[PDB]
C-alpha cells in the first residue's frame, strides 16, 4: 500500500532511523507519538532494518497517545528526518528532530499537519500538500 509515487520516487532513500524510532505525530488527532513497526516497500535482505522513508508510508503504532489510538497498527507518513540528505538540486535538508503523521491507507492525513513538511513528501502524497500551509 498505497501506493502512489510520484513521478519518480523523488529520488533516493534517506532516514532518521529505521524500525524502533519515535517521531512526533504532528496531527490534531490525539496520537502524541509514532513508533515504527516497519516501512512499506522495504523488500530488504539479510540483517538490515526496514529503514525510514524520506516521505514514504510506514507500518507504525501509537505508543504514547490516546488509548483509543494506542495499540492497533497504523499506516503513517514520515514528514521530517532529523538525519540529513542531499537532493537533486545540491541542498542538504536537515531537521530539528524526526516527525511524521498517522494516516489513512490511501495515504490521507487525518486533521491538519503541524509544522514544516519537506516538499518531496508533499509531491508524493497530494493529500499532504492539501492539508498544510507549510511545505518547505
Amino acid at each position: 500500500m498505497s501506493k502512489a509515487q510520484a513521478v519518480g520516487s523523488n529520488y533516493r532513500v534517506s532516514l532518521g532511523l529505521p524500525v524502533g524510532a519515535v517521531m512526533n505525530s504532528a496531527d490534531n488527532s490525539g496520537a502524541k507519538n509514532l513508533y515504527v513497526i516497519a516501512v512499506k516497500g522495504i523488500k530488504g535482505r539479510l540483517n538490515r532494518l526496514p529503514s525510514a522513508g524520506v516521505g514514504d508510508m510506514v507500518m507504525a503504532t501509537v505508543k504514547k497517545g490516546k488509548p483509543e489510538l494506542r495499540k492497533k497498527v497504523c499506516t503513517g507518513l514520515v514528514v521530517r528526518q532529523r538525519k540529513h540528505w542531499k537532493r537533486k538540486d545540491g541542498v542538504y535538508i536537515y531537521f530539528e528532530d524526526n516527525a511524521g503523521v498517522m494516516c489513512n491507507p490511501k495515504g490521507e492525513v487525518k486533521g491538519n499537519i503541524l509544522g514544516p513538511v519537506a516538499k518531496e513528501c508533499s509531491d508524493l502524497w497530494p493529500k499532504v500538500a492539501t492539508n498544510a500551509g507549510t511545505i518547505v
Binding site: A132, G133, V136
Partner: protein
C-alpha cells in the same frame, strides 16, 4: 445563462400554472452525465460549466459505455429565463437494479420527468422495475435517445448509422411497451418514416418556402414513438453537447428558409430532398435518394471530427461556418483542435433559448398532469384510489389544482432519506435562519469566494515557499488566485459547509404544497397515529383531532421554517413553491413515517400511503451484538421505516428484530444500512431465510383414534417416517408400529390426536391472518364477536354442533356459515389453520368451552377444564413432525382428552407415579388434600355443579398435564406421513424467442416446473408462467442477467405454496428418538435448517417449553 440570481427567482416561483416541473431520470442512471452536463452550462446561479459540477455530480464515460454508479444527489437548477420560472432541479434517484419496493420509492421523486430507457439492452429486471413506475404515470415523459457522438467519434461510423441506431432503440422500447398496456399497433410506429410531403405542391413549395406542417402528439401521451412537440433529443457529452431534433431543424432553416416544425417532422424519420435547389420530384419517395443526417447537419459534425483528427486550423473553422453557426474566438489564440470545439460548445450549449419553448409547448401546466398520476400509484391503496369515489372528502378538487391547500400545509412521501451523522446542515443558527444571507452566499460561493478561500488556506500558517514570491506578494484574492477559477474553482465552498455543530434534521422525500413561508406551523402526528391508519386502504374520509382515538393523545404543534430537498442545502431562500414540486419536507422535519403524515391539518386522508411490494414477504430474524446495543437496533429500525416503506417496527407480528422487504438484494442492503448510515452498531446476519410450510400428507392408523382415513402403511413418501423416530420413549407400553399417545402416568390422563390435510384456498386465507388475537381469547371481558364467527367457519369448518368429528366437513360441503366459538388455540399464532375439534358436550371434565370463549351455549355450565387445555395444545401446534416450526397446511383433530380416569394399566411407570403422588387412582370428583388440577371454573365463578358433583382438584398435577398434551401430539405428528410444502412465487417472466430455453434451464436447475405460456398479441415477446420456490428465487434476476444479457425480465408474484419432493426432516431434540439416528443429509437438510437462526420471531407467539414435569431431578424418574 452565465448570470442568474435567487432574488429574481423567489417572486416568479410563487405563481403557478406557468412553471412546468421537469426532472432527470434513467433506468440505472444511464445517460445521466449527458443530461447533467448540458444543464450545468445552462444554469446561471452556479456560473456556467466553468465553475460548474458542484453540489454532488460525478460525470463518467464508463456509465455511457454502460455503467450504473448510482448516487443520491441534487443540484439547485432554477432558471430566470424571459418572464417565467422553471423548477427543473437535477434529480438523481439511485433506484435499485432488481424489482423491489426500493425502486418504487426512489424513482417516485419526479414531476414531468425525461426518461432514458434501454442502454444497449432491453426486457431486463433493471428496466422493468425503476421505469416501471415512470411510464405507468401519465406525466408526459419525453423520449430521450442515447449518445449519437459515440457513432461519430468512438466507433467511427458515418451519420447514416444514426438512423439505424434510432430504429434499434425504438425496437427495444417496443418490447418494454408490450409488458403493460398493448403494443400491436405500436410496432408500425417502431420504424423510421415521413410519408407526408409527397405531392408536387409540397415538394417544391414548403421545401423552398416556410408554410406549416403539424408536429402535435398522436395516439399515446407517454414516451412511446412520438416527437412530443419537438422535444425528442440525441443527448451527448464527450466535449459537452446540448442538442437534438430541434437543433438539427434550426440549421436546416438557416440554409434557405423552411419552418422548424416542418423540418422536425422530416428529421424524426427518413425524408429525401434531392438538393438541386431544395426542390424535389416524386419517384424518390418510393425508391429513395439519400437521408437527411448524412446529407447535412451530422455530416458537418463528422467532417469536423475528421479535420480535428488530422489537425487543420482553418478547415475546422470553415466546417463550423458551413454548419450554420458562429465560429467563435479561439481559432488563432491556441493551437485549438479540440479546444476550438470546446469553445464553440460553451456558446452553443445554453439550451434555455430552444428547449424551454419546446417544454412549454409540451406541457401547459403541472396542474393538468397531476390528475392523471393519482390513479397510477398508491393514494388510498392497491385496491382503490383517491380519483375514484372511495376516500373522497376534498381530494378531487384539490389535486386538479395540485397540492392540499394553496397556503401550504405540507404532506409527506417516502423517497429514502439522507444519511445522518455525516451531513447535518439544517441548523438553528443565525445565517440559515436569515434566508437572505444564505442566498447571497450561494450566489457568491461558486467562483467569487473561492479565491478568498484559497488565499486563506495557502497563506495562513506562513512560509509555504522558501525564498519565493508567495510570502512576498501575500495575496488577498488579487492576481495569483484569479487563475485556476475557470477549468474548476479550487475550494469554492460548494454546499455551504457546517460552520457550527451537527443537529441532524435531513430528509429527501416529495411534497406537493402551495405558497409556504418562514415560521409556518404544522400539527405533528404521533409514532402510531390510529386515525391516519383507519383512513388508508378503505373508503373512509374524515378530519378530527385526537380525542383518545390515537394511541398518544396530543395537542402540540411543530415548526416548519423552510421547504428543502437539500439541493442548495441548509434552510433555503427559495421556499415559495407552487402547487406541485420536486422538493420534500423542510424546516426541522425528517419524519416521513408510515402512520404519521406531517400536515397543518390534525388528521386528513393521506395523499400517498407508502410504496407497494414487488414480491411479497422477504424476511430475516437477525439479532445484534454486545449487551447495551440491543435496543439500538430497534431505534435504528425507526429510522429505517423513514427510509424504506416496509420494516417490522410498527405492530408486532414477528417481533421488532425482523426485516420486511420486497427484492433480491434489498434485504441485504437493509441489513447493511443499520451498521452504517443509521445506528452505528454491528449485528449477527443470517442469510438462510423463509421457513417453509410443514404439511402432513394423511392421518394415522388404528391405535387409539378410530375416526380416521384408513391405514398409514407406506415405506416412505420421500424419506422414511416410521423407523427414523418414536416407538420407545413412551412406545414400549403401547403402540408397536408407531406412537400416537402417551403413558407417563399410564392411563390416568391420556390423549390421541390426528392431522388431516386441509384444502389449499382455505389454508391461504387462514395464513393471511384475518382473525385477531382478541377473536380467539377473552370474549366475556371484551365485546362478544359476531361478524368474526362466520368468517372462521368459511375458512376452517368446525362448530360446537358437530358430534361426528372433522371428517364429515372436510370431505362434503365447503363454505358454510355457522358459529366457531368455544375454541382454545385456533392455530399456532391464534389466527392460523389449526383447530381443536369439539365432538362432545362433556367426556369427564374435558373438551368443552374455552378459558372465556363463548357462543351463548352451555350443556350444564360454561365451567369445564380450559386452563390445562389452552396452554398445552398451543405447544402441540408449534412442534412439527421434525420438532419446531408451526403446523401449516393442516387442520388438527383431537379424538379425546380424558381426566378422572379410574382405569389404569399395571406397569413400572404407573408404580412410579403412584409412589410420587400417593394416589390409588386418578380423579377430580374425589380428593385427599393432595395434587393439583387447575380449571376455568375457579377464576370464572368458583365451584362446579351439574356437569360434575365436585370441582376438579385431583388427578395428575396441572403442569404435568400441560406437558403431556404436547408430548403425545408431538409423537403422533412424527409417525404420520409428511412432505415439505415449499414456499413459492410464480414467475410471470417477460421473455423473447431466443431466451426462453435459457430461462427454462435456470428453472430446472433451481426446482419447479413450467405450467403454460401466454403470448402477447402481435409481438415477438411472450410471458412464461412457471412456479419456483421462494428460497431459490433470491439472486434470480442477477443469475438471469449473467446467463444471457438480461433478455428475460423476471417478476415474482406470490402464488401460494406447493408440495415438492424434498426430505422433510431435522434431527429430533429428544435423545431417546436420536438413538434411531436421523441421517445427516436426509434428516438434517440444508433446506430444513430454517429454525436454528431463522426462527426467533414473536410479536404474537413462538413458545417452546421443556417437556415432562414430576417434582424434582431425583424424584422425576426412579422406577421409570
Amino acid at each position: 445563462m452565465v448570470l442568474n440570481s435567487l432574488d429574481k427567482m423567489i417572486q416568479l416561483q410563487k405563481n403557478t400554472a406557468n412553471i412546468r416541473n421537469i426532472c432527470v431520470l434513467a433506468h440505472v442512471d444511464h445517460g445521466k452525465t449527458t443530461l447533467a452536463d448540458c444543464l450545468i452550462s445552462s444554469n446561471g446561479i452556479i456560473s456556467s460549466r466553468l465553475a460548474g459540477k458542484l453540489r454532488y455530480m460525478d460525470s463518467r464515460e464508463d456509465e455511457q459505455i454502460r455503467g450504473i454508479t448510482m448516487k443520491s444527489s441534487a443540484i439547485s437548477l432554477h432558471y430566470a429565463t424571459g418572464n417565467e420560472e422553471y423548477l427543473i432541479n437535477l434529480i438523481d434517484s439511485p433506484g435499485h437494479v432488481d424489482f423491489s419496493s426500493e425502486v418504487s420509492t426512489a424513482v417516485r421523486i419526479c414531476d414531468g420527468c425525461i426518461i432514458v430507457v434501454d442502454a444497449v439492452e432491453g426486457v431486463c429486471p433493471q428496466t422493468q422495475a425503476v421505469l416501471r413506475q415512470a411510464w405507468l404515470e401519465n406525466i408526459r415523459p419525453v423520449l430521450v435517445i442515447n449518445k449519437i457522438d459515440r457513432l461519430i467519434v468512438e466507433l467511427k461510423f458515418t451519420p447514416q448509422e444514426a438512423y439505424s441506431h434510432l430504429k434499434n432503440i425504438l425496437e427495444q422500447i417496443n418490447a418494454l411497451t408490450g409488458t403493460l398496456f398493448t403494443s400491436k399497433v405500436l410496432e408500425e410506429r417502431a420504424e423510421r418514416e415521413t410519408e407526408s410531403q409527397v405531392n408536387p405542391n409540397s415538394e417544391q413549395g414548403e421545401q423552398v418556402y416556410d408554410w406549416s406542417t403539424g408536429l402535435e402528439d398522436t395516439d399515446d401521451s407517454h414516451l412511446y414513438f412520438s416527437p412530443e412537440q419537438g422535444n425528442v433529443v440525441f443527448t451527448s457529452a464527450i466535449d459537452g453537447w446540448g442538442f437534438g431534433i430541434e437543433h438539427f431543424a434550426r440549421i436546416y432553416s438557416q440554409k434557405i428558409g423552411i419552418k422548424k416544425e416542418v423540418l422536425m417532422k422530416t428529421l424524426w424519420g427518413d425524408y429525401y430532398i434531392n438538393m438541386k435547389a431544395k426542390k424535389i420530384m416524386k419517384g424518390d419517395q418510393a425508391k429513395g435518394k439519400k437521408p437527411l443526417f448524412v446529407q447535412l447537419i451530422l455530416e458537418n459534425i463528422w467532417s469536423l471530427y475528421d479535420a480535428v483528427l488530422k489537425k487543420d486550423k482553418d478547415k475546422i473553422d470553415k466546417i463550423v461556418t458551413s454548419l450554420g453557426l458562429k465560429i467563435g474566438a479561439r481559432e488563432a489564440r491556441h493551437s485549438d483542435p479540440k479546444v476550438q470545439i470546446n469553445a464553440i460548445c460553451s456558446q452553443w450549449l445554453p439550451i434555455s433559448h430552444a428547449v424551454l419553448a419546446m417544454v412549454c409547448q409540451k406541457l401547459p401546466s403541472p396542474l393538468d398532469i397531476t390528475a392523471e398520476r393519482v390513479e397510477r400509484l398508491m393514494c388510498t391503496g392497491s385496491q382503490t384510489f383517491d380519483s375514484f369515489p372511495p376516500e373522497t372528502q376534498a381530494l378531487k378538487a384539490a389535486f386538479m389544482k395540485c397540492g392540499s391547500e394553496d397556503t401550504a400545509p405540507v404532506i409527506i412521501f417516502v423517497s429514502k432519506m439522507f444519511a445522518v451523522d455525516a451531513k447535518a446542515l439544517p441548523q438553528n443558527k443565525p445565517r440559515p435562519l436569515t434566508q437572505e444571507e444564505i442566498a447571497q452566499r450561494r450566489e457568491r460561493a461558486r467562483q467569487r469566494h473561492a479565491e478568498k478561500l484559497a488565499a486563506a488556506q495557502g497563506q495562513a500558517p506562513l512560509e509555504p515557499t522558501q525564498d519565493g514570491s508567495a510570502i512576498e506578494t501575500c495575496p488577498k484574492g488579487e492576481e495569483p488566485r484569479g487563475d485556476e477559477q475557470q477549468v474548476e474553482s479550487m475550494t469554492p465552498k460548494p454546499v455551504l459547509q457546517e460552520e457550527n455543530n451537527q443537529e441532524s434534521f435531513i430528509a429527501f422525500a416529495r411534497v406537493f404544497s402551495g405558497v409556504a413561508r418562514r415560521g409556518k406551523k404544522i400539527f405533528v402526528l404521533g409514532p402510531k397515529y390510529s386515525p391516519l391508519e383507519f383512513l388508508r386502504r378503505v373508503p373512509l374520509g374524515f378530519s378530527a383531532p385526537p380525542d383518545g382515538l390515537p394511541q398518544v393523545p396530543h395537542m402540540a404543534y411543530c415548526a416548519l421554517e423552510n421547504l428543502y430537498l437539500l439541493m442548495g442545502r441548509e434552510l433555503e431562500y427559495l421556499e415559495e413553491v407552487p402547487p406541485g414540486n420536486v422538493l420534500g419536507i423542510g424546516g426541522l422535519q425528517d419524519f416521513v413515517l408510515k402512520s404519521a403524515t406531517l400536515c397543518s391539518l390534525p388528521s386528513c386522508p393521506p395523499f400517498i400511503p407508502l410504496n407497494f411490494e414487488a414480491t411479497p414477504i422477504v424476511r430475516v430474524a437477525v439479532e445484534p451484538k454486545h449487551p447495551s446495543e440491543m435496543p439500538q437496533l430497534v431505534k435504528g429500525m425507526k429510522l429505517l421505516n423513514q427510509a424504506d416503506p416496509c420494516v417490522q417496527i410498527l405492530i408486532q407480528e414477528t417481533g421488532e428484530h425482523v426485516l420486511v422487504t420486497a427484492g433480491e438484494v434489498h434485504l441485504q442492503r437493509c441489513l447493511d444500512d443499520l451498521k452504517e448510515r443509521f445506528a452505528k452498531i454491528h449485528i449477527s446476519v443470517s442469510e438462510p431465510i423463509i421457513p417453509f410450510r410443514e404439511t402432513i400428507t394423511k392421518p394415522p392408523k388404528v391405535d387409539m383414534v378410530n375416526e380416521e382415513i384408513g391405514k398409514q402403511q407406506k415405506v416412505a413418501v420421500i424419506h422414511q417416517m416410521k423407523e427414523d423416530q418414536s416407538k420407545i420413549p413412551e412406545g414400549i407400553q403401547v403402540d408397536s408400529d408407531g406412537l400416537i399417545t402417551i403413558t407417563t402416568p399410564n392411563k390416568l390422563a391420556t390423549l390421541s390426536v390426528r392431522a388431516m390435510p386441509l384444502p389449499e384456498e382455505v389454508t391461504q386465507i387462514l395464513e393471511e391472518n384475518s382473525d385477531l388475537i382478541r377473536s380467539m381469547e377473552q370474549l366475556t371481558s371484551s365485546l362478544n364477536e359476531g361478524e368474526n364467527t362466520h368468517m372462521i367457519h368459511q375458512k376452517t369448518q368446525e362448530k360446537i354442533w358437530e358430534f361426528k368429528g372433522k371428517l364429515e366437513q372436510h370431505l362434503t360441503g365447503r363454505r358454510w356459515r355457522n358459529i366457531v366459538d368455544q375454541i382454545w388455540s385456533f392455530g399456532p399464532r391464534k389466527c392460523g389453520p389449526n383447530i381443536l375439534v369439539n365432538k362432545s358436550e362433556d367426556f369427564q371434565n374435558s373438551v368443552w368451552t374455552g378459558p372465556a370463549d363463548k357462543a351463548s351455549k352451555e350443556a350444564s355450565r360454561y365451567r369445564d377444564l380450559g386452563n390445562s387445555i389452552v396452554s398445552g395444545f398451543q405447544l402441540a401446534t408449534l412442534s412439527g413432525p421434525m420438532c419446531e416450526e408451526p403446523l401449516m397446511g393442516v387442520c388438527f383433530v383431537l379424538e379425546k382428552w380424558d381426566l378422572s380416569k379410574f382405569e389404569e394399566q399395571g406397569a413400572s411407570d404407573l408404580a412410579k407415579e403412584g409412589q410420587e403422588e400417593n394416589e390409588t387412582c386418578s380423579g377430580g370428583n374425589e380428593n385427599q388434600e393432595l395434587q393439583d388440577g387447575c380449571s376455568e371454573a375457579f377464576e370464572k365463578r368458583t365451584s362446579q355443579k351439574g356437569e360434575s358433583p365436585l370441582t376438579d382438584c385431583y388427578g395428575p398435577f396441572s403442569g404435568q398435564l400441560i406437558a403431556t398434551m404436547k408430548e403425545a401430539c408431538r409423537y403422533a405428528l412424527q409417525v404420520k406421513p409428511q412432505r415439505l410444502m415449499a414456499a413459492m412465487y410464480t414467475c410471470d417472466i417477460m421473455a423473447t424467442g431466443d431466451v426462453l430455453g435459457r430461462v427454462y434451464a435456470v428453472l430446472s436447475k433451481r426446482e419447479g416446473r413450467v405450467l403454460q405460456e401466454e403470448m402477447k398479441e402481435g409481438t415477438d415477446m411472450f410471458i412464461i408462467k412457471a412456479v419456483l420456490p421462494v428460497a431459490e428465487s433470491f439472486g434470480f434476476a442477477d443469475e438471469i442477467r449473467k446467463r444471457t444479457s438480461g433478455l428475460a425480465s423476471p417478476q415474482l408474484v406470490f402464488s401460494h405454496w406447493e408440495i415438492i419432493p424434498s426430505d422433510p426432516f431435522w434431527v429430533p431434540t429428544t435423545e431417546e428418538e436420536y438413538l434411531h439416528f436421523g441421517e445427516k443429509a436426509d434428516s438434517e437438510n440444508q433446506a430444513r435448517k430454517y429454525m436454528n437462526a431463522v426462527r426467533k420471531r414473536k410479536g404474537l407467539y413462538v413458545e417452546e417449553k421443556i417437556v415432562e414435569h414430576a417434582e424434582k431431578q431425583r424424584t422425576l424418574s426412579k422406577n421409570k
